[PDB]
Design a protein around this ligand. Structure first.
Ligand code: CA
Length: 124
């Protein structure tokens, strides 16, 4: 599962904190969800969960294969500049390219300080 995704979001977050703060927060973190976010740091979970919808379903390695999240792959870093193991393949390159705009996008969006274990009668 997404466990070297924690390895991933140290790399692309100069400043902000991963999962420990980033996992419980905001409204629609999961497959579908459609209201909107609360702040757009539920909106960086919007992009990685719908890139993951196309990854659980994927033409390069189709799912008699069984390779869902972070098990075989690892990655690269620096600006925020996350990618993959830089010889990067077809389907191993896709699941690490969704976990890229997970790690990068926690530094692109705002943050839920607020929705941080949420309320959403309110936000969604
Ligand atoms: Ca969603």
């Amino acid at each position: 599962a997404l466990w070297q995704f924690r390895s991933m979001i140290k790399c692309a977050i100069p400043g902000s904190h991963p999962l420990m703060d980033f996992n419980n927060y905001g409204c629609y973190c999961g497959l579908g969800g459609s209201g909107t976010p609360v702040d757009e740091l539920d909106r960086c979970c919007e992009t990685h969960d719908n890139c993951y919808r196309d990854a659980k379903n994927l033409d390069s390695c189709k799912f008699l294969v069984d390779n869902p999240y972070t098990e075989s792959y690892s990655y690269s870093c620096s600006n925020t500049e996350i990618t993959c193991n830089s010889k990067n393949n077809a389907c191993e390159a896709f699941i690490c390219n969704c976990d890229r705009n997970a790690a990068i996008c926690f530094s692109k969006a705002p943050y839920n300080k607020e929705h941080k274990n949420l309320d959403t009668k309110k936000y969604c």
